[PDB]
Amino acid sequence: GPKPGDIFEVELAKNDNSLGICVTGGVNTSVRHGGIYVKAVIPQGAAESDGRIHKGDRVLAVNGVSLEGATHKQAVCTLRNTGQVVHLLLEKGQSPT
Numbered sequence: 001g002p003k004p005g006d007i008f009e010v011e012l013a014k015n016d017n018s019l020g021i022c023v024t025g026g027v028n029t030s031v032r033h034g035g036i037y038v039k040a041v042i043p044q045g046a047a048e049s050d051g052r053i054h055k056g057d058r059v060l061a062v063n064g065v066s067l068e069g070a071t072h073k074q075a076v077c078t079l080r081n082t083g084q085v086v087h088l089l090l091e092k093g094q095s096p097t
């Protein structure tokens with residue numbers, strides 16, 4: 001598989017179903033690393049259906065936009081405001097599934 005600490009890109013299509021993602025992190029929200037961790041995933045929502053993204057996975061960028069620094073609300077509203085195919089950048093070292 002990909003190595004731990006591997007930066008990998010996922011293009012998540014919202015083809016199957018609604019996004020059904022939420023995130024946490026930001027300015028030193030609950031999570032210490034402030035990483036934009038996936039907070040919730042709707043069962044068989046786009047992330048879960050795609051199987052690549054799950055809860056606890058950490059996003060850093062969104063279509064080339066460093067989401068780091070931003071608050072958890074922007075992080076959610078960002079996904080919520082993104083389109084069908086979105087380029088998500090994630091780095092390994094995420095929580096278990």
Ligand SMILES: *CC(=O)Nc1ccc(/N=N\c2ccc(NC(=O)C*)c(S(=O)(=O)O)c2)cc1S(=O)(=O)O
Pocket residue numbers: 021022023039040072073074076077078080
């Ligand atoms: C998984 C999760 O946490 N989802 C969540 C959490 C809280 C709410 N309640 N109110 C709310 C609505 C909408 C927004 N932001 C945008 O619409 C861009 C916020 S936030 O900005 O404070 O996060 C809060 C809703 C939801 S939802 O089920 O994802 O709508």
